[PDB]
């Protein structure tokens, strides 16, 4: 009930890229070519453009760079590169898929 009526929060949340914790899976460069390349530089480049043109505030660029880190293993770095070690919650598809694999193979 708190955050759903914060309209600049919903703006700044559906528009921040999904690599950085937001919702947006459509960078502007996705509209011209496919998803090839580094995801992280595309995320930070879109955040840079959206800050430049005045959509997204200057708060968010300072806060993403100063973000406290997540857990991380060497296995978490190796099983997925291009991966910022931020504290992030796990997708239910990944959790349930991996649980069903590790149950059926017992």
């Amino acid at each position: 009930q708190s955050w759903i009526n914060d309209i600049p929060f919903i703006h700044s949340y559906v528009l921040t890229p999904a690599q950085l914790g937001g919702l947006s899976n459509l960078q502007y460069s996705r509209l011209y070519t496919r998803n090839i390349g580094d995801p992280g530089t595309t995320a930070f480049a879109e955040v840079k453009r959206l800050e430049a043109v005045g959509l997204l505030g200057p708060n968010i660029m300072t806060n993403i760079l100063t973000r406290p880190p997540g857990n991380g293993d060497w296995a978490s770095l190796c099983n997925d590169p291009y991966s910022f070690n931020f504290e992030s919650v796990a997708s239910p598809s990944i959790v349930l898929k991996k649980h069903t694999q590790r149950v059926l193979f017992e």
Partner: protein
């Protein structure tokens, strides 16, 4: 292991074999609100008096 056909029926069968957990199931149900609050507390609503180089 990434070649199994995890449909919803397969997932219900494997949950009927072994239940998920207590902390993980609370994270599965509350996923959208926890994701939104994590975005809110980390990158939208923060002081961050250190400014990096």
């Amino acid at each position: 292991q990434g070649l199994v056909d995890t449909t919803n029926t397969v997932i219900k069968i494997a949950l009927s074999r072994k239940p998920l957990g207590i902390k993980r199931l609370a994270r599965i149900i509350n996923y959208s609100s926890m994701h939104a609050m994590l975005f809110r507390d980390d990158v939208f609503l923060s002081n961050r008096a250190n400014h990096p180089l």
